[PDB]
Every structure is written in structure tokens, then in C-alpha cells.
Design a protein around this nucleic acid. Sequence first.
DNA 1: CTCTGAATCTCTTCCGACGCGCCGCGGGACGTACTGACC
RNA 2: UCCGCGGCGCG
DNA 3: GGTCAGTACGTCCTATCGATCTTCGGAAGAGATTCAGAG
Lengths: 49, 90, 50, 1342, 99
Amino acid sequence: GQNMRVAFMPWNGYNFEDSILVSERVVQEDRFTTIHIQELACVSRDTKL
Amino acid sequence: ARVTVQDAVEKIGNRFDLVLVAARRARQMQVGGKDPLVPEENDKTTVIALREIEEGLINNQILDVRERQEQQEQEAAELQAVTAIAEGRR
Amino acid sequence: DIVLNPLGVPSRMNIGQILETHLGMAAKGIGDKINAMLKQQQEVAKLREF
Amino acid sequence: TEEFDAIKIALASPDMIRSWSFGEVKKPETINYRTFKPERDGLFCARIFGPVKDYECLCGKYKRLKHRGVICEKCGVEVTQTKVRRERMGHIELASPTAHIWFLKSLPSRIGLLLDMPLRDIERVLYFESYVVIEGGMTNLERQQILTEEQYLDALEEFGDEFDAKMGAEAIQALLKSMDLEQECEQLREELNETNSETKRKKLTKRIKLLEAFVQSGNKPEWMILTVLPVLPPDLRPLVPLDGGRFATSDLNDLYRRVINRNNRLKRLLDLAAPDIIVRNEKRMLQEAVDALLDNGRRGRAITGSNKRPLKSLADMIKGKQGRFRQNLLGKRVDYSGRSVITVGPYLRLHQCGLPKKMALELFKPFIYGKLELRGLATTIKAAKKMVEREEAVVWDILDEVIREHPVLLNRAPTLHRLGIQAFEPVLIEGKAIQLHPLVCAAYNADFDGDQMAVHVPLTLEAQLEARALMMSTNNILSPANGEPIIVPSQDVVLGLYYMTRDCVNAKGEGMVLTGPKEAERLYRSGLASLHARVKVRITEYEKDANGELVAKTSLKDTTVGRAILWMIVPKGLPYSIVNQALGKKAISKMLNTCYRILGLKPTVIFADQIMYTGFAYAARSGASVGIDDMVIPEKKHEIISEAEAEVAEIQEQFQSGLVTAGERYNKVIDIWAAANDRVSKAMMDNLQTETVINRDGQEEKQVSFNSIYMMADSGARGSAAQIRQLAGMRGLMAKPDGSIIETPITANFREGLNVLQYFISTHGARKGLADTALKTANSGYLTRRLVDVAQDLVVTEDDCGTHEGIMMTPVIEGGDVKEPLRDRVLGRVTAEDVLKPGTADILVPRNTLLHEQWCDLLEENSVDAVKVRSVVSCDTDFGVCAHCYGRDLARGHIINKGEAIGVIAAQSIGEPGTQLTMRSSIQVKNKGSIKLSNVKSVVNSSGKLVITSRNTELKLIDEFGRTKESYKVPYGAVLAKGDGEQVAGGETVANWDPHTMPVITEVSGFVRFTDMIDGQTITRQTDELTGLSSLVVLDSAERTAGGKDLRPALKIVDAQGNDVLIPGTDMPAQYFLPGKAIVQLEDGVQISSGDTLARIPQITGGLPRVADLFEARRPKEPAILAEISGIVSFGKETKGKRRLVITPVDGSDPYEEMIPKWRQLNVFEGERVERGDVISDGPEAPHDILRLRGVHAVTRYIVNEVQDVYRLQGVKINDKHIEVIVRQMLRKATIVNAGSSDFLEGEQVEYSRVKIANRELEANGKVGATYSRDLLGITKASLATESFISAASFQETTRVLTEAAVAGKRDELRGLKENVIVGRLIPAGTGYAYHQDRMRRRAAG
Amino acid sequence: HARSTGSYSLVTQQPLGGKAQFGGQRFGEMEVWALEAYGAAYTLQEMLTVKSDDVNGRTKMYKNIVDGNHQMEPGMPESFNVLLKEIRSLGINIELEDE
DNA sequence: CTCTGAATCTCTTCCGACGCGCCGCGGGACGTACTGACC
RNA sequence: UCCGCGGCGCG
DNA sequence: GGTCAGTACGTCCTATCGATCTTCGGAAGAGATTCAGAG
Ligand SMILES: [Mg+2]
Ligand SMILES: [Zn+2]
Ligand SMILES: [Zn+2]
């Protein structure tokens, strides 16, 4: 994963039940951005007529 | 707008009867073309019916009386049409 | 960067995350003192000593 | 369309099956492969089942709606819709009869008990391994006699054709057809009258019931043997094309193909005049094939496909969790639904939820299409779909228009109770995560660690109004289980309010005098004053007068800044004392409950939202944080550990010296380690809870600490004493996997590091807990399903039944502790009788009054000790309960409305907390009061003490206010130093008995002689080795001589002149009897005083299983014995561990007799008098015995007390109404003792409602009503015994219920909720209730 | 995942299951119990009949929603017809009375 | 000393939480010859 | 498109 | 009579039971066997 600066404090209910409040700097720095590769297949088949 | 239906429940006395009466009135307003008895205030027929029930303008007895009046008017209109047809034939 | 609720720790009794949070801070702090020392272009001797 | 009033089930005649069929299937082929077209007479035939494509002939000659109804001449396929392939059935004409497996193997065997023939013999006959005799002339053979092949050949040689004998289903059918039902019924009734054996009576009565059911239903017994086999429509067993030209086939197709192959082979063999052996084998194989098709695996090994898995038969299609009832009818997949991960919306109002915009667009697509076509933007539906797909701006505006006041239903699985689904107004949000209001999470049991929630869209106006009026979160602020608030502040909400409402000894701005809360807020936000500053603030509060108008009073109050700022948001009408304290979770919940009770729903909703906002804001401002320094370790901990180690070392040295045993050593070490753990915990808490601060004068003063962990735990936001102990003190002794406690505890805490050994020890408990949760979920779910099934019929159906009967409510007290006050047990219930002011005849509370909070307060003020309330079990309503017997609706406060489904609510309220339940000589008075004795008979000894001559004696403590708050049970022969009505002091102890000794007491003074006390034969007299004194010992029946069995040692009392002593008040001589193994210290003729005792006689599972056993009415392993009738006792003659006891009634002419295994410690003596229900031998009490001896109120009290004991031990609050509802559902069946003038039969089991109505009408006509007893069926048996066969089939044991309903020809009237759910019509509860009433009107008019 | 209308199963005539199949959420028996604890008879009926299995019902509901009429015309669920046919296939005559 | 009933023992059958997601694997089909009906 | 099995994961 | 479509039979492939995956706990009901009491 990534090393993240963490403050332990309640913040206006956005950490109410295990919830996590994340800075926009985390998104801007692409620290948790991940690459996903999907394989899609098109199959040509013999059919009647 | 509406958040709680407690006033309408007090007016009707039962939540289930409230739902039935409000559904009847809202269906009158939605499909039957009836005009609301309270300002619409961009509310939907459900909430308008609830607000009419809150003010006491709509209950089961009132709806039954209104439907009886409408049925009597329809019967009178049919009688007038029959009379006009008879006058045309005569 | 992230704000976490203090209330999870007591009931969950996963105190190891608190200690890590402390040690990581220290782990960062040393780096900061290196980073500034690198930004100031200080001599290799002071960097080696630290 | 064609509305139906009922659903009827019966056996199918062969002609009936032919009437269903549209053609005979006679080819084991599905489709041609050259042309993908069904075969001419196969399982998918077009001319039998219907066209493959709509309104098109198979050959294509006719292909349009204009040829509708035309049957093609070329191929015989009717031109119609393809849907007929979903409906039209077929048939197979079997070359040989085949027995239906359900009516053969489903115990009890219907064929077997109809023919009075054993099941194994019928199996042997059916499967062609033995013959049976049908018709016999003058031959020796008997009808229904089985013959082996050798025996058959011998009989044939001996008698030729004078006797008829056959094999197989043909023989069974011939036997069935040749039985006269009426004649057999008459003969069986005569035999039942003549027979004496109870087992014979049971067999005869069950056979008579079966025969009478066959007679009444109109079914013929021979219909149990199949001659024509129905064929399911092809669309219900589809032949699904796959990739690669393969066809996915249902297992039913394979089963049908096997049956058709065997049938055709048998027909061909019959045509060719095959030998007997070959045709017999083929018939056996056909029978096996049909059995596999009907219910595969019921006999022999189930036939398997190429995957080696058993093939799925029709029974498997109906049965089980994956069957139609539970997978498709009771539950369904629904349109207009979605799901997504939930997050917190802390900005949300209580009635609204954050709904993703994309989810809303997809879910409301049809509404958007309609609104687009209304505004002319889209001419056709295709244009609307293209517009929505492109996601134009006008589409977003339309979507905002359509969701304005359209509620959506949010559901989280598992839906343990009705709060698992709630309605919210959706606010459209960006992102893909649903936003949930924080206050509803507790009701949902939802956290934000990955939870997903499902969203449903109500379509119709009635659905929208039900969501708004019944299911919306603003209506669900009270828990239906207990009435306490369910929408309660938690986590940060509670911590912030607690931090806001705490005071500090010296703080910035202390001593200021404030004009009001606004000035406090100004001072706080300006930084001039702290939240905890003690200040005097002018506060204006309001109180409702007698008329209900708010009267205002203003005063200067000592408070803190934070408390005034919080008072800014409190609604008018509440006192300031509700906020002038440190607010924990309990305080906030109580404040909300007070607000709801005083001001109503809307102020409470606004108050809850404001509380949430304020708590979040001030928790954020506090900056509360957990650091490593907050886990403060006591400085005394190390020395406590050292002292404990020294003590264990001393005990170890003592054990090595041999002074103590291994078990004593283990117990001592455990005790000292527990004491050390308690000391460490006390030191930790004492150090944590207090901090020292310098006050205004410059002096150190102690105050409650602001430590973060202590603030979290004390506030109730999170944590507890045990978890703090584990963090900052030793985490204590751990248990091995077997449950035994390890000798050496885990000395380290979590701030310190556990060793490898300590961590390895803790992992045992960790994994045990995880696995226990895994199993507990399943157990609780099964219990909840059973409860729902038993209680789903019960609905409030009338306002008042007019019952004066009820149950008596008193506070639950055990061992001097008041476990439950009367206020909780009586709040919200209707008085069965008028409550009188204690000590007077004045009426304090009138009859039929709902006891709300004010009435309960009035009851507390007058110190009323017991009330009588109306109960569900005592309601006289037929097929329902009245609103007054049920009482207050716990979720709404007022009396319950008609139509409320109280049974499902009760079942959910009991089952939801199931996963919290665990799964795997001295009496000291504690309070100053007076002593009272009940069920007591007393005598005075020579020492002036008191001896009790009753076994059910109860000791109570009464206060000067008139209340009772102690309860104890006094054993027989116990000695008490205080009389009845005396006063005792706090801590005074009075008790004298030996649990290992059973005493024998004498009434008056005299001299004691011996009778039937002869050495060897009955007794043994000796100078004992233990003490060297004279002693007499009584021998047991397995120890004494055989000739002395009828000689019973006895003691007799004489006066100073030798005259026989008579018991005072009676003519009975003073005689006493000694049981086996009894010892008498006295001799022949020694003197005794009044009230003298001389006798030396030798003398666990709880949790969720306990609740399950209580609700299933399971008998205990060693049940207690209760006196069946009131009378005098006497004994009989014993033999090999059994004794006979006779109770002679005071006036009854018939003495009762009982057999007792003598290993039970018999309590009552031979001369004592007993009352019905008195404990003859101690032990667990069987609920059935309680019901039949003490009554309905007794059994309901017992069940309620036991279940509530379990739940209250675990800490769960469930009102007794729900347990009473379940109990009433358990008492639904009765048995008839005397039929009287009614049509019922003695010994038959009927519904109690039916017999009650019959007796009512008979007494209306003046006839003699039928007498009945009530039966206590367990929840499973009660569910399976319902009159609706559909509900029972949906619950469990589908094959048995269906078979019994088929033979009985039952008719289901669709009265319950489950039946109408299966049918798909409005349930007879809630909004649908009125609808069904209209039905009841119309069927009355018709 | 969200669904308004899509494919339906062949035999049960009910919505498919799973996001990959664009299926609908399962309104299980516990959810039915929850709706029965309320008075939500109409919601329960529309989930049992129109939104799941009634073919004519769902077509008419879709048409009425497009037309602006939020009224339901419930019929017999098809799964009940499947159950009746399966019981009749076992040789048991199960029928509806007074149709 | 024997017979019957009741009690006890043995064997068989039924039930066992809900919801959601992903991957893999499997699942009778095709060909040729002979017979009947229609033109 | 259906069914089944196996394995893994989350609440 | 000749032609086309439909229907019928064979191949894949066997041959020892041996492949085959195989083995819970608790409660209730029915049937079979045994013990005690009465005659
Ligand atoms: Mg969670
Ligand atoms: Zn045709
Ligand atoms: Zn009643």
C-alpha cells in the first residue's frame, strides 16, 4: 500500500462508523490509483442458417 | 413538503385508514382530474392529499359524499340527455 | 491526508496501529531532517553523522 | 380476474389425469437434430403441448393471427400462443400399475395403515419378491397373507385355482379396491370399544381416522396406485440451447425418458407373450423408475446422471430451501431494485438518504420516459430511451422532478426485524455509494466497513403512501420489541455531547454571569470562555400545565458554558435538569424518550437531528485522540504481580509438602490470581478516573479525568471496563479449548507486548469466539423462522373481547434481588380488574385502563405491589386478538390498531437478539423489613424456635411502604428463630437445614416406640464403628430379606401413661414412617418434645438452546413429579426399583395411582396431604404437566419467566407481550374428553377456536357443551398442525403435509399471511386488512 | 448496480440474479416478514406480483407508469402456476375453488 | 410358569441464518438405412 | 439461456 | 413407381460387482424386543 499521514480525531461525522475521510491531495497524487486489465472475448460460431 | 404524517394520523385515527384515504384522494387528483383543495406548492399528489387530510378537508365521509354528489350529477346529465333525445324524436 | 476515528481503537483493542502511527511519524521525521539537509547542500560529513 | 375463495387438494383419479392431459407421450425423444424441431410424440411434442412460436403452425402452413384456433391438417398443431406450452400437461399410460412412492414410504404408510399390513410386506409384494393373497374359497389361505415363491408353488399344487394370489402393484390395487370402508370402520369401532390395550387403541383410532378421512373426502383408495402418469408441461422443464450446439436438459427429462423406455419395453414384452420372469423384472424396473421420477432417493440409491450426482425429482422441485415455496413464492427477485456500498451522510436529515444519480436514473427510467413524453421532448418510447442513454441535461432535470417526494426503501441483510427496511426521501448525489443517516445505523446494525445496502422503488400510490406513513424513518423512532428509542446518538455524537456537558474545576471564564445561552455561545466562539467553565446563566424553561399550555419560568442556574449552548437546541417543555449534567449515551437516550413522551413525534425528530449535528460538531472541535500515553498503567501493578507470584510459590511449596491436594492447589491458585486481577483492575480504574488540577485559590483538587480513553468509556460512546482493563491492566485468565481456566494468567496488557506464549494462549479464545458466532447465526435464524411460522396468522381483529380474565403481574424477585420492577412489566397494558389503593377499598385505577407513564407513576406513589392485566393468552377473540388484550403498541405508544400483524412482530422481537445470547443452609436478609411466611404450617420446639411442616413454604420481606422485595424458599423441617409478621434487621441471618439431610419431625411431646422394626428382615441394629454408639439402619428393597417387603418400619407416639397419641385436630394416631436408607438415633420408648426432629437420610444449560427448548416444549431429561389430584397419600408394594403411590381424594370416589422409580428422592411422606400441582419429587418441571395441572396462566408464566431469565441475563430487553403471543400460538389445540351434544369425537384433536364456537352455539341452543383439555404443542409441531396446509407445506416437511392433505382432501381458506403471500394477494393485515373485511362482507351478502 | 426492467428466468418468470446478468435484488422471506410487520400490504403485493412474476401485471404497470398512472392491476404470480403444475405432476389434484 | 401391556431400544427421516461478488469445470449428438404416404 | 458442482471472498 | 420425409437402430464402450465421491449431531416417530405385573 501507501504511507499516509493520519490524524486520529472525529471530524464532523465523516469518520462515524469505521468511515475514512481522505484528502483531495491523495487523489491528486494518484497514490491509490490502480490499473485494471479486462479480457473481453467475441466468439464467432457456426449457427443454423 | 412533508416529513411526518402524525397530524394526518390524528385526523384519521389509524395509519392504515390514512394510507387508504390518501391513496384514494391522490388517485382522484392524478387520474381523475380533480383539483386540489390546498395550494400545490410543487408537492406531489401523495403529499397534497396528506396536507388536505391534515387540514380536515378530506376524509372517508367527505370523499363518499363527493362521490355521491358526482353520481347524482351524472344521473341527472343522463336524464337530460334522454330528454333531449326524446324532444328531438318528438 | 487521512482522518481516522479514535473510537475504533479502544473497543477493537488493535493498539498496534497507534504505535505504528507513532513510529511512522518518527520514521518520517528522520527523513525530513535528511531532506532539509539535502536541500541545503550540506557537507557529506554532517549527513553521515546524522 | 377469476377470484377464488379457497385452494383444494385431493387425490387424482386416472380419469382426472386424462382430463388434464392434451395427449399421450409415447416416445423418449426430445428434438430432432437435423431440424431443431420436437419429435412426433416425444416429451416436447408440438401437437400435444403447443406451438413452438406464437400463432405459427409447426409446418408453417398457417403463420398469422387470422388463423387463430385452426388445427393444421398436415401436422395437427393448433395455432395459438406459445404460452400454452407452459400450461398444457400430458400423460403416460403405464402398461402396469405403479404404486405412488409418497403413499407407500412417507411415514406412516397410507397403504400400510389402510390395509393394516406391515410396510416391509407391502414392499416385498410391490417389488416382485413375494406374493399376496386376494381371494380365497374353502382354501386354508387367508386374505392379505404373504407367500414366498416356494410357498406359492406349494399352495398352487395343493389347491389349484381355488385361491387368487398376485404380485406387485396390481395385487395391491386389487386389495385396495376390494375393501369396504364402511364395514371396516364399523368393525374397527367395535374392536376399539372391546379392546383394552392403549397401544391397540392408538393403532385402531389412527386407522379409523384414516378410513373416515377417505370416506369423507371422496377419494378412493385405489387412486393411491398410479395407472396414468401425468407429464409436466415442457416450458417448465426447458430444453435450453447452449453454445456449441449442445442442449441443456432438465433432470426431469431424463427421468421421464427412463420411465417411457421402461414402459414401452414392458408393453412390447406383453405383446410378444414373454415369460413370467422377464415381465416381472421389467415391471419392477418400471416401478423403480416411477419412484425415482416422483421422489428420487426415497427408496434405494438415487439414480444419478453422468455427473454422479442424484437426479432432481419433482419432490426436490417442491421441497427444501431451493424449492418453489421458499425460493420462488415466499421470496422473489424484484425489479426496480439496486444495491451499493453505504457511506455516512452526516448532513442528512432523518427522513432522507443519499442516492447515487446513476442508480436513480436506472431505477426511475419508466417515470423519466413518461415525463419526457408528457413534455413533448420524446415522441416515442425509443426516442425517450435514446435520450436517457445519452444522459442529456433535460433528462437530469426530469430525474430531479420525479424523485422529489418519491420515497425509496433501503434494506440491509440480514433483515432481523422490521427496521431492517426503512423508507427515505432520496437526495441525488454524485458518486456510486449510498449515503445513510448516522442515526438509523443502529436499527440497521450497519457500519461502514464495507456494507452494501439494497434500494427498492415503490411504484403505486398506495406503496408510496405506505412508505411515507408506515415505513419512513421518522415513524420508527421507538423499538417495537421494547418501546425504548431505537434511533439513539452514538460514537462521535455521544462523545461530543459528553465533552460539551462536562465541567472543569478551573477554566477560562469561570464565575462569569451570563445573560443567556446566546452569550455563552458568543463567549465560546470568541475564545473568552471554555465549554467547561462553571458559570451562572439565566435560563428560561417551560412546563406544560394541567391544561397543556406551556408556562415559562426564568432563573439563574449554575451550569457550564457547553450546557447552555446545548440548551439552545432543546425543545420548549423540557426541564433544564435534562441537560445540566454530563450527558452519556443513557442520558441522551432518556432525554429523547422524555421528549417523545412529553412533546410528541415532530419535536423529537427535530431534536434528534440537532443532537446529531451538535455532537458531531463539538466532537470535531474537541480534537479527541487516542495516544499511547492515554493507556496509563498503574505503578502498583508490578508489586501486585510479585505478591501473586509469591503466593503461588507458597502454594506450590505447600503442595510439594503434601498438605494440599492437586485440585485444591488448582482452585487456590485460580482464586489468588483472580484476586490479583481484581486488584490490578481497581488500581487502573482508580488512577484513570481521577486527575488533579489547581483551582482558583491555588489549591490542588481532584476531578473526573479528561483522559481520552476514560472519556470514551465513561460516556458510553465506545469501550467498556473490560476492554480498558485489557488495554491498561492484565488481560487476565484464559480458558483452554476444553473450557478449563489456565493456571497462569496473561499478566501483560496490550500497551505492553504479549509474549509469544501469551498470544498463543489468547488465540484459543479468539478462534472459539469466531466459530461460535458462525454456528450461532444459523441457530438463531432457524429459531426465528420457526417463531415466524408459528405466529404469522395472529392479527389484531377486534377492539375489545370483553374478557375480565387476565394475568397477575408482580415484580420479578430472585434471591433478595429485584430483577425486574413492576413498572416495566405493567407499562402499556390494560387493567383486567380495578386496582384498589393499598389498605383501602377505594378504586385507585379503574378497570380497562391503558397504564401509561402517569398511571405507572401513580401506582409507584401508592406502592401497589401487584396488578392484574389483560393478556393475549386470555383473549376470547376467535382467530385473532383484541386491541385491549394486547395493549400498547410499543413502537407508537398508543393502543394497538386493528389489522396489526402482532405475530410477526413478536417473532422478530424474540429472534433478533438471538445472536447475542451465549451458546457454548444459610439465608441472610439484605434489607431492614418485616418477615412473612406463605404456604406454611408451623410448630414450636422446646427451645422456643420454629419448625415448618410444609414443603412449599416461602419467606418474604415487606417494607413499611407495603412493598415486598425479597423471596426465598424454606425447606421442610427448617428451623427459624423469627415468627410470622416479626421485624428483622439488615444483615440478620436465620436459616437451619442440611441440604444433604432430609428431616422427620414430630408434632407433640411423648415417648416413641417402634413397630415392624425387626433385625435383618427390615432393619439392622448395631453399635456403629464410626462412633461406638447404638444405631438403627433401614435396609432397601434390594438389601432386606424378601419376606420383610410388606413390613414397613414405623415410629409411634404414646403419652406418659402409654396411651396412643392422636394428631391434634384429627382422629388419626400419631404415626411416622421411615423410608429406605433412613437412620433413627432414638431407641424404643425414649422421650421427645413437641416439634422434635430426628432423621439422618442421604440426599445448568442455558442460552439460545434454552430458549429453543422452552419454545419447543421439550420435556426435561429427569422431569419433576407432580401430584395429579388433591388428597391423602399412601404407598404400595415395590419391585425392582419401582414404587406405587396412591392418592385418595377427600371426596372423590376414584383414588389416583402412580408409579415412581424409587431412585428418585421422594419428597412427600406416606401420611402427608397433597394438592394438585404439588411437587412429589423435585426436578425440572415439564411444561405439559404445568399446563394440565395448574392451568394456562401457570404455563405462560413459567415460559415467560424462563425466557426472560435468559434474555435478562444476557442484557436484552424484550416485552412479555411477544412471549405471550408465542405461547398463545402454542396453546391452539385441544382434545375432547366428553363430546356432549357436539359432533366432535372423544380423543380427537381440534382447534380450540372451533370447539369454543361449537360450545357457544350449543349453549345458545341449551345443549350440553363438549368438555376439553388443552395441548401445549411446540412451535414446530404447532406450525405443522395448522389448518392451512399451504402454510405448513411452506414451512417444513412438504412431503408429509402434502400427502396427509391429499388423503384427507383438505380445503385451504387462505386466512393467514403466508397463504396470501403465496397466492399474491393483499395480506389480511395492515392496509390490506380492510380489503379482506370487504371480502367477508361480500361472501356474507352472497 | 441498479435495474428497472430486464431479462426474466424461463421457468420462474422472475427477474434474473446478479449484476453480470443485470438482475434484480432478492426480496427474501425476511424482507417479506419486515413488510408484514408494518401494514405494507400494497408494497408487498407489488413486490410479489407486479415487480417479479406477473407478466400482464408488469407490462400494464410499465405502461401505466409511462402514462402517468401509478396504479397496479395485480394477477396470479406465474411461480404459483408452476407450483400447481408440479403438484399435479405428482398425481395430486390441487385446484382453485370458486374461480 | 405364561401371557399381555408398557417401557425401552433400535432404525430411519428431517432440519440445519440471510444477502452479494468472482473464478473454474461439466452436462447426448450425429449418421445411415429402411418404410410409408403422397403425387 | 438453464442447471449442477467445486473453489474463493465480503457484509 | 418414384421421391421425400419421417422413423428406427447403431456407435461412442464397457463386463465385475471394487468406483467411489464414502463416515455429523440432535430431535421426533415408528417398529421391534424385553421386563414387570397379573392371572
Ligand atoms: Mg460492518
Ligand atoms: Zn401444420
Ligand atoms: Zn381480548
